Amino acid sequence: SNLSTATVSGASYAWYSDSSLTSLVSTAQNPMIVNISTDTTWYLVVTVNGCSSVAGSTTVIVYPTPATPNVPANFAVCEGDNITLSTSTVASGYNWSGPNGFTSNVQNPVVITNATASNAGVYTLSIVDGNGCESGDTTVTVTVNGNPPVATITSNSPICFGDTLTLSSSTNCGQSQWIGPNGNSSGTLGTPGGNNVLWTIGSTTNIPSTDVNYLSGDWYMICIDTITGCRSESNTITI
Amino acid sequence: SNLSTATVSGASYAWYSDSSLTSLVSTAQNPMIVNISTDTTWYLVVTVNGCSSVAGSTTVIVYPTPATPNVPANFAVCEGDNITLSTSTVASGYNWSGPNGFTSNVQNPVVITNATASNAGVYTLSIVDGNGCESGDTTVTVTVNGNPPVATITSNSPICFGDTLTLSSSTNCGQSQWIGPNGNSSGTLGTPGGNNVLWTIGSTTNIPSTDVNYLSGDWYMICIDTITGCRSESNTITI
DSSP states (O other): OBOOOOOOTTEEEEEESSTTOOSEEEOOSSOBOOSOOSOEEEEEEEEETTEEOOOEEEEEOOOOOOOOOOOOOOEEEETTSOBOOOOOSOOSEEEEEOGGGOEESSSSOOOBOSOOGGGOEEEEEEEEOTTSOBOOOEEEEEEEEOOOOOBOEEEOOSOOTTSOEEEEESSOOSEEEEEBTTBOOTTTSOSSSTTOTTEEESSEEEEOTTSTTOOOSEEEEEEEOTTTOOEEOBOOEEO | OBOOOOOOTTEEEEEESSTTOOSEEEOOSSOBOOSOOSOEEEEEEEEETTEEOOOEEEEEOOOOOOOOOOOOOOEEEETTSOBOOOOOSOOSEEEEEOGGGOEESSSSOOOBOSOOGGGOEEEEEEEEOTTSOBOOOEEEEEEEEOOOOOBOEEEOOSOOTTSOEEEEESSOOSEEEEEBTTBOOTTTSOSSSTTOTTEEESSEEEEOTTSTTOOOSEEEEEEEOTTTOOEEOBOOEEO
């Protein structure tokens, strides 16, 4: 900040760091005070033609520290899905930075699509207040879950009507959701486990010849990780 | 704002915050008044060679607050369609901001095409008046409706003439609009429900062998959500 006092003919200006007037900081009508972190008072003695007056003074007041921004809780995204960052606070401008060179100046940054491992890491946000002061750093940790591998489906494809159709794969997936000629509708792919032939636990299923799903055509398997929440595809197999 | 008074030889300038002249604000021929939010009057006493005159004064007048912009009512768009933002007001410049990093400086921003979930959220508009003052923030909330899933159609495809043709799917859609070899014209796809074989309630239809639509060839199903207004496609099925 820049202090300003009266210009007086014949004057010598002595600025002091303390009211005791024992130690000088400057000699000017308009001195600058730098690196101010706390309120600070400067005292001024003006001596004219040898006559030293009572020191005058003023205190430079430091604006309050701006509030910390509001950001989301640590999240998790599955690879290939989107990462959305946002804040709910109000600022004269925003400053986001992060993994893979990510940067933004708004309260709703462009969504990172097709997120992958390189987008994982810590995203940081600071904001600028109305008078230009920058606030502190709040962070969001983003983890990116990998997908399970693509499964390979094998089957007893050349099957005679009336026999049992077996579909299987070697991949150790979780809830195997099988998709056949009847589609992948939420009405047919009902609650997993039990006796649901189309949504099994473990990479295998056996469709009886009397079952509604004992159909020819192109089948695929979706691997579901019951811990992570990620899914992966499989090869098309013709039955 | 910057006040300006007469420069007088031998003068000392004392500016006061009140007509009572008990508290000083500055000492200059041309002082600046800052952070003005209300009309404010400064008073000036000029003392020359020890003679103090009657204080002069002036009031800094604050321009009126600019009017709030006119924007559309909360709207809704179906995914894949366009989001159009606009305002009907007049400004020296416009300032739009929103989801996915959206920004614009005009009264007709570029249309956001192929809108999706990431474009949903609150869009905000402020404007700048003729003298440079910014107005308040008015908003438009935009919601983006998801589409129903793609349906899978199955049928008794290898059918002998004279029998009944059944088309169905497992997807729980609303008004199933069936499109066959006769096209999807507004004249054939008449009022839904009743006995309209091509526009049914629920995912199924039965076409009699005596019906005009008992045709071979490539059929598809359009799923219509009667609450949302969104539509989705289906696989081509050959009959």
